[PDB]
Enzyme design. Structure first.
Site, mmCIF file in Angstrom:
data_model
loop_
_atom_site.group_PDB
_atom_site.id
_atom_site.type_symbol
_atom_site.label_atom_id
_atom_site.label_comp_id
_atom_site.label_asym_id
_atom_site.label_seq_id
_atom_site.Cartn_x
_atom_site.Cartn_y
_atom_site.Cartn_z
ATOM 1 N N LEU B 16 43.045 -22.389 79.083
ATOM 2 C CA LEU B 16 43.208 -20.946 78.887
ATOM 3 C C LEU B 16 44.411 -20.561 78.036
ATOM 4 C CD1 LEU B 16 42.176 -19.613 82.455
ATOM 5 C CD2 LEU B 16 40.848 -19.564 80.380
ATOM 6 N N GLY B 18 48.711 -21.717 76.667
ATOM 7 C CA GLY B 18 49.983 -22.429 76.651
ATOM 8 C C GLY B 18 51.162 -21.545 77.002
ATOM 9 N N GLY B 19 53.557 -25.266 81.335
ATOM 10 C CA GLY B 19 53.066 -23.932 80.991
ATOM 11 C C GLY B 19 51.630 -23.931 80.492
ATOM 12 N N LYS B 36 47.076 -23.643 87.301
ATOM 13 C CA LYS B 36 48.261 -23.763 86.482
ATOM 14 C C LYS B 36 48.786 -25.156 86.596
ATOM 15 C CE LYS B 36 51.165 -20.256 87.514
ATOM 16 N NZ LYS B 36 51.620 -18.857 87.775
ATOM 17 N N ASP B 127 59.981 -9.415 83.726
ATOM 18 C CA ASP B 127 59.283 -9.465 82.445
ATOM 19 C C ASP B 127 57.947 -8.712 82.490
ATOM 20 O OD1 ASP B 127 59.610 -10.384 79.759
ATOM 21 O OD2 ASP B 127 58.592 -12.278 80.103
HETATM 22 C C1 B49 Z 1 38.152 -13.604 76.393
HETATM 23 C C2 B49 Z 1 39.459 -14.423 76.435
HETATM 24 N N1 B49 Z 1 40.462 -13.924 75.491
HETATM 25 C C3 B49 Z 1 40.206 -14.220 74.082
HETATM 26 C C4 B49 Z 1 40.255 -12.916 73.262
HETATM 27 C C5 B49 Z 1 41.860 -14.177 75.897
HETATM 28 C C6 B49 Z 1 42.247 -15.646 76.176
HETATM 29 N N2 B49 Z 1 42.758 -15.680 77.547
HETATM 30 C C7 B49 Z 1 41.914 -16.067 78.655
HETATM 31 O O1 B49 Z 1 40.777 -16.465 78.452
HETATM 32 C C8 B49 Z 1 42.448 -16.048 80.111
HETATM 33 C C9 B49 Z 1 41.678 -15.803 81.259
HETATM 34 C C10 B49 Z 1 40.180 -15.478 81.349
HETATM 35 N N3 B49 Z 1 42.464 -15.896 82.336
HETATM 36 C C11 B49 Z 1 43.743 -16.214 81.963
HETATM 37 C C12 B49 Z 1 44.953 -16.515 82.881
HETATM 38 C C13 B49 Z 1 44.976 -16.386 84.227
HETATM 39 C C14 B49 Z 1 43.918 -16.141 85.180
HETATM 40 O O2 B49 Z 1 42.733 -15.957 84.971
HETATM 41 N N4 B49 Z 1 44.491 -16.090 86.489
HETATM 42 C C15 B49 Z 1 45.922 -16.460 86.382
HETATM 43 C C16 B49 Z 1 46.937 -16.554 87.368
HETATM 44 C C17 B49 Z 1 48.255 -16.895 86.988
HETATM 45 C C18 B49 Z 1 48.550 -17.093 85.621
HETATM 46 F F1 B49 Z 1 49.790 -17.434 85.268
HETATM 47 C C19 B49 Z 1 47.543 -16.981 84.639
HETATM 48 C C20 B49 Z 1 46.213 -16.653 85.028
HETATM 49 C C21 B49 Z 1 43.758 -16.312 80.569
HETATM 50 C C22 B49 Z 1 44.957 -16.673 79.717
#
Ligand code: B49
Ligand code: B49
EC number: 2.7.11.1
Lengths: 285, 282
Positions: B16, B18, B19, B36, B127
């Site tokens: 997902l 970038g 930790g 994580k 933050d």
């Molecule tokens: C559609 C996806 N996007 C592209 C435009 C954005 C990329 N980002 C993604 O996919 C994304 C998704 C779908 N979930 C997270 C992160 C977390 C999550 O779900 N629970 C957590 C609990 C703690 C934490 F520290 C992070 C997360 C990301 C980065």
């Protein structure tokens, strides 16, 4: 620790120092008659006592000759009292404000003892984060001591984000300033601070002490930034100029560790002992 | 936590962000989670990480991601948490553009509920920003963590403060380079900057160097930021920005007091507003 009045075990004496962070008082053990320092940390009624307790456990687990000994703690009526080893001459800043500049051999001795303390802290996975003259204590026998072990190298390691810190900017490494625009610092930030502390003991202030602290941090992030240097070339030997050059190397990947610095000529040379500080303490009259 | 491979219980699906974070599925329930991963070095202290995990176990609130457990295996520490399908508000607005005023009002209400909780547990987030605010497929809002204790280095006979991202930091956090400290009201300021960030796609002064932004906050005559286009927003949103961006922490309202503000007290604030925003991604 104990939930009891510290006056049960000590005679509270003179205020040695303090700030917003809290106060430190001289005291005497009622039974043994030995002097101690008592850190007093004031608490608000809604403060979380468990977090204070957690910090104390670090004082219970860490032990080294060049870090102030820990004797116990007392929580009583929203004050946390921490019993530490007494250092009769106070800090190097209290000393150099009267005595003036330290000699090259006096600085060499100080740095060796502080590096022994740092090598230990770092091996216990702690980072001091504020090495400076005010945070280096001296006892009446001329022995050097750090006032604490710092805190864990991993702060917020479980978070999915980074946290930087602000100690005292004039002593902060460039990569700590850069955490405001990039990610990461490590235990080597203490080695840079020791180099500034050597300049602070030679000259009576760190470099750029008259510049605003946030402008000092800003200048460190620019390309073509030059690390500070001793202003008087002739007054100091080649070994001291090299110790300053290597401790104040801009890149932390190229900066030596506390263990590596203990092999440097400036701190490996013979004749470095507590007697050089006993001579510094004789200049207080 | 357990000393075993998290793959015993989870099917790892995707990296997902970038930790390091992975999307994964629970093998027994079929529920999605976020895992994580923290890489450790051979000489890293395990107790320091496991002490941090405990804090995660002690705190529970609807507006912070739920904690499901942890696993230590071959110098990798894994933390299992609630999966938030839409990612961060920053991932969302980089595709969709500006949020509407009602969408910002619902986000702020939910974050203030999380912060009021976090602050009652004697934590400070440090933050608050769009990248650190998660959204799930149902359009519910979650902070990614509970922050760290309000007191860090309290026992030390010296001032030491830990710092978030300069563009979202309160003036009193900048003043720490000179003297004293700060408290939990720094998160109320950061939420006000986040509201401008969600409305404009950048925080104020994003083109100015971060240390120069902090330096300006310590000068005499410093003036807090405002929304750029006055007519696009109601007086309630302008006032929300004015009170959260109070220079003096002594006059800035607490998260509980901010929950009674007209902007976040108004009716019609619900996850449906965010479901609308998530339709704009498709
Ligand atoms: C559609 C996806 N996007 C592209 C435009 C954005 C990329 N980002 C993604 O996919 C994304 C998704 C779908 N979930 C997270 C992160 C977390 C999550 O779900 N629970 C957590 C609990 C703690 C934490 F520290 C992070 C997360 C990301 C980065
Ligand atoms: C040379 C004497 N000075 C004038 C120049 C007097 C001013 N300085 C003084 O009084 C002084 C003395 C005599 N001890 C301390 C501090 C500590 C000490 O002893 N153990 C500790 C353990 C932990 C800690 F966080 C501080 C101390 C000071 C500030």
């Amino acid at each position: 620790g104990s939930n009891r009045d510290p006056r049960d075990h000590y005679d509270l004496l003179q205020r040695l120092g303090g700030g917003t962070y809290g106060e430190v008082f001289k005291a005497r053990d009622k039974v043994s008659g030995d002097l101690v320092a008592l850190k007093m940390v004031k608490m608000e009624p809604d403060d979380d006592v468990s977090t204070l307790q957690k910090e104390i456990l670090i004082l219970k687990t860490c032990r080294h000759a060049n870090i102030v000994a820990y004797h116990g703690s007392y929580l009583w009526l929203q004050k946390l009292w921490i019993c530490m080893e007494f250092c009769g001459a106070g800090s190097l800043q209290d000393i150099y404000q009267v005595t003036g500049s330290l000699s090259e051999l006096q600085i060499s001795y100080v740095c060796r003892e502080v590096l022994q303390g740092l090598a230990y802290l770092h091996s216990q996975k702690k980072i001091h984060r504020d090495i400076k003259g005010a945070n280096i204590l001296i006892n009446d026998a001329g022995e050097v001591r750090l006032a604490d072990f710092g805190i864990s190298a991993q702060i917020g390691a479980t978070l999915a984000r980074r946290l930087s810190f602000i100690g005292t900017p004039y002593w902060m490494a460039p990569e700590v300033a850069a955490v405001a625009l990039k990610g990461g610092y490590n235990e080597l930030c203490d080695i840079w601070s020791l180099g500034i502390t050597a300049i602070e003991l030679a000259e009576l202030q760190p470099p750029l002490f008259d510049v605003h602290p946030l402008r000092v941090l800003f200048l460190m992030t620019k390309s073509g930034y030059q690390p500070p240097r001793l202003k008087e070339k002739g007054k100091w030997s080649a070994a001291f100029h090299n110790f300053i050059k290597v401790t104040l190397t801009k890149s932390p990947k190229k900066r030596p560790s506390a263990t590596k610095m203990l092999s440097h000529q400036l701190v490996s040379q013979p004749g470095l002992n507590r007697g050089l500080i006993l001579d510094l303490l004789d200049k207080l009259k």
